[PDB]
């Protein structure tokens, strides 16, 4: 897709596999979106147990951010930033709007997280 990110989900699966999974999820849940969430390269943070998420479309990016902070057990003092196609998304946007504007040809929205505000730093 756009951007210059690297996601292990894409390293691990060819496009045809990903598109079949993403299309299936999109069809089955019209009011939710499929999202891949992974730690950015070099980020000094834990990985999630799962990297595929089914997210309500009206959940805001901000609320999703708080959920991921909890999943990786961050302390309040710890920094964390989301990146989508190399841009930190606004917290007031809905996940559905973020999905519409950024999802890739395999129908997944890809979100990276890092303790740094520059992707890959």
């Amino acid at each position: 897709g756009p951007g210059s990110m690297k996601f292990q989900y894409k390293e691990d699966h060819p496009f045809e596999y990903r598109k079949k999974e993403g299309e299936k999820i999109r069809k089955k849940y019209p009011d939710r979106v499929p999202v891949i969430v992974e730690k950015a390269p070099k980020a000094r943070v834990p990985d999630l147990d799962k990297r595929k998420y089914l997210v309500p479309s009206d959940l805001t990016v901000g609320q999703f951010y708080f959920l991921i902070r909890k999943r990786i057990h961050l302390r309040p003092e710890d920094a964390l930033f989301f990146f989508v196609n190399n841009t930190i998304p606004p917290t007031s946007a809905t996940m559905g709007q973020l999905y519409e504007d950024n999802h890739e040809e395999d129908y997944f929205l890809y979100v990276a997280y890092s303790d740094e505000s520059v992707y890959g730093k």
């Binding site: 499929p34 999630l48 799962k50 595929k52 998420y53 089914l54 997210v55 309500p56 999703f64 959920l67």
Partner: peptide, 11 residues
């Protein structure tokens, strides 16, 4: 479970 490779977000 069959399809538990995805985390389903609810409130």
């Amino acid at each position: 479970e069959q399809d538990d490779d995805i985390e389903v977000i609810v409130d």
